[PDB]
Amino acid sequence: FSNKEYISRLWHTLKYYQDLKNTRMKSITSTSQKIPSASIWGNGYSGYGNG
């Protein structure tokens, strides 16, 4: 709960979100290469009515 642990918590939180952004970029470049990959959020709709 001191300073040297409160910054080591923030290093073990930023390094998670950097890998999460790498996943987010790879799942964008996959669909831009016409490969239907899933994202961080779910797939939005289906063929039902909305596209």
Partner: protein, 44 residues
């Protein structure tokens, strides 16, 4: 009790890489009719 200049320096990157909402390239096929009917849905 902390050195909050370094804490804020790291927390800026944490706020930048935080998954708040979708970006422009990952929105998919934006359907205007779905948005226009969801705005009248009086949900939150």
């Amino acid at each position: 009790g902390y050195d909050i200049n370094y804490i804020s320096k790291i927390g800026e990157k944490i706020d930048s890489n935080k998954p708040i909402f979708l970006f422009a390239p990952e929105l998919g096929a934006i359907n205007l009719h779905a948005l226009s009917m969801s705005l009248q849905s009086k949900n939150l």
